[PDB]
């Protein structure tokens, strides 16, 4: 219809100076983009460092295996028991490649399953990968990529020095069976002349390896199993060392934390998707204006306070927790001063920012103390790890919950020796957390000066229960008033401008990360009044079938009530009874409903339809 859409071409090029940041200077000089980029770079470097420290032990074991095979017929292979998330783990092999080019120990070729449909293509990919790895470390066509040229090249170059030939198979399950068996027989035929080491990337278990390898193929295999750590362990490591770290100013809420952990633990064991979801949360939080650039460290917070414009005051006054700051003051002159004059609030702001930072630091410290107090208990109602206690104490007031009363019941029944051991371990862990990580942080001396005399009061309570039944309730109420009531408040008991740090917008993130096409199609095919906001298409119930609806909705509500095989003529008569041109409208609506995959035409039968839903 349009001059852009044609009947011959499928692609259209708009090349403007192509040879062989999208945003300009307007967005990059704004402070919120710089603080977002800085926070995301910090968090990404931290999670990358944690992944390297997780992988380095079995990486060193693989390098020791390859070098021990080099210091030495069947070929030595090494099944690397990785998880079900293969594109989460491929960078693992990448790091191993650099280690094999650290000591000049071996030559690395990565055989992907997509480039190995046949045996001929797999052999060409292997020889081309080894030769171009040689050409990259220090062009032939793919027609002359055979094992004869590889043996001539290896006799020409590396005989004078043994350099191993490592063949990495990252996706072992996705390979063809016959191509894999012929490739293993080819690599086992050439041993003695070319030193081959084979590693694998098996995801499921070793039973798949022993099932897909026959008797004659496994007769020439000397495999050794290596096990990498699991994906929920990596989730708990990332969630306890990065997202609950006190040195970042951006805090997630309880709802978004539960939503992201639900996506991980229920749908896919991918650290990559969790990281991109947290990045989208960080982006949608920081892109709320230049006033949201204050969610950083304290000196830069004071600088951005002294940098703010006029509308930033009017967008930090729109927060729903700013009104508990206004209504709770009995003054009037201060109300006039902070509502309009745009500078009295600019002077009152840094005390509120410092109160928010102190509240989050003391929240993390009291959460560490509470999870050491609760984790040693049997049956663990409040949660074993730190993250479920984080969700349960941010989502509501924890003392009003029945699970805290169940924890108090199961905790108050305990004898004095295990009780004093638990509280001594709790004080040791809390002071260890206070001096090992809190002290090098900015504005961390004030948090230690708040918590530590209270902790010494708890220590005198521990000595008082050492020298002593009725002191136990005194110690428990002292825990409740000194740790849980003042420093473990819910999100509604927060400091008044905590929306600058806590990200609570969950609906837009939930609808822009989790994708529901079928829900939108079903909603727009039941009632278009949800979308068009028209005043003749409204429905009290979603099956009333009002005649002035859009044309696809009537056809949907007509075939929705019938059975599997839909006759077309009574369909057309029903559409003519609800509402030349009407036959063309019915033909267009049937074509639109077939294009979306809701019905289809029958092949054995003429003038009927088969519906594809249920």
């Amino acid at each position: 219809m349009d001059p852009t859409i044609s009947v011959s071409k499928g692609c259209f090029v708009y090349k403007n100076g192509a040879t062989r940041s999208l945003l300009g200077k307007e967005v990059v000089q704004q402070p919120f983009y710089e603080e977002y980029r800085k926070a995301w770079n910090q968090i990404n470097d931290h999670i990358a460092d944690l992944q390297h420290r997780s992988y380095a032990r079995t990486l060193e074991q693989l390098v020791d295996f390859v070098v021990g095979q080099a210091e030495r017929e069947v070929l030595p292979t090494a099944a690397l028991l990785t998880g079900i998330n293969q594109p989460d783990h491929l960078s693992q092999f990448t790091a191993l490649t650099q280690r094999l080019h650290a000591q000049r120990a071996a030559m690395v070729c990565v055989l992907q399953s997509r480039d190995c449909a046949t045996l001929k293509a797999a052999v060409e990919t292997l020889v081309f990968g080894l030769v171009e790895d040689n050409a990259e470390v220090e062009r032939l066509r793919r027609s002359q990529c055979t094992m004869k040229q590889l043996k001539s090249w290896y006799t020409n170059n590396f005989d004078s020095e043994r350099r191993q030939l490592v063949v990495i198979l990252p996706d072992f399950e996705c390979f063809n069976a016959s191509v894999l068996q012929d490739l293993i027989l080819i690599l086992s035929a050439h041993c003695g002349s070319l030193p081959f080491v084979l590693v694998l990337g098996v995801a499921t278990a070793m039973t798949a390896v022993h099932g897909t390898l026959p008797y004659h193929v496994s007769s020439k295999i000397r495999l050794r199993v290596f096990q990498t750590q699991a994906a929920p362990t990596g989730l708990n490591e990332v969630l306890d060392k990065v997202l609950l770290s006190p040195k970042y100013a951006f805090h997630l809420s309880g709802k978004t934390f539960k939503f992201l952990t639900h996506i991980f633990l229920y749908y896919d064991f991918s650290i990559h998707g969790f990281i991109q979801g947290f990045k989208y949360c960080l982006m949608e939080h920081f892109f709320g204006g230049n006033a949201f650039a204050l969610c950083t460290d304290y000196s830069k917070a004071l600088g951005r306070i002294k940098q703010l414009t006029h509308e930033d005051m009017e967008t930090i006054r729109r927060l729903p927790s700013f009104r508990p700051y206004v209504e709770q003051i009995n003054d009037c002159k201060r109300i006039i001063a902070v509502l309009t004059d745009d500078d009295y609030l600019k002077k009152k702001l840094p005390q509120l920012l410092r109160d928010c930072l102190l509240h989050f630091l003391l929240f993390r410290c009291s959460l560490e103390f509470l999870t050491e107090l609760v984790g040693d208990l049997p049956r663990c109602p409040l949660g074993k790890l730190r993250r479920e206690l984080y969700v349960n104490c941010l989502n509501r007031a924890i003392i009003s919950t029945p699970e805290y009363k169940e924890c108090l019941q199961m905790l108050s029944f305990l004898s004095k020796d295990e009780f004093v051991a638990k509280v001594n371990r709790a004080l040791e862990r809390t002071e260890q957390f206070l001096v090992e990580e809190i002290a090098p942080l900015e504005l961390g001396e004030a948090c230690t000066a708040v918590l530590r005399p209270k902790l010494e009061a708890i220590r005198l309570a521990v000595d008082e229960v050492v020298k002593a039944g009725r002191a136990l309730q005194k110690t428990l109420q002292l825990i409740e008033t000194q740790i849980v009531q003042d420093h473990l408040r819910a999100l509604q008991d927060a400091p008044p401008i905590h929306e600058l740090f806590v990200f609570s917008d969950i609906a837009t993130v939930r609808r822009n990360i989790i994708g529901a096409p079928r829900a939108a199609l079903h909603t727009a095919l039941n009632n278009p009044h949800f979308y068009m906001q028209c005043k003749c298409c409204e429905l009290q119930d979603q099956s009333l079938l009002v005649g002035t609806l859009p044309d696809l909705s009537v056809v949907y509500k007509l075939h929705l009530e019938c059975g599997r095989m839909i006759n077309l003529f009574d369909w057309l008569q029903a559409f003519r009874s609800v509402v030349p041109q009407i036959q063309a409208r019915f033909t267009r609506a049937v074509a639109e409903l077939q294009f979306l995959g809701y019905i289809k035409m029958s092949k054995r039968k003429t003038d009927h339809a088969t519906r594809l839903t249920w």
Partner: peptide, 17 residues
């Protein structure tokens, strides 16, 4: 309650004192 209505209500309440 909207922001402008509550703002005008607090301003009229505090300017009367």
């Amino acid at each position: 309650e909207d922001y402008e209505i509550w703002k005008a209500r607090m301003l009229a309440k505090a300017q009367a004192k």
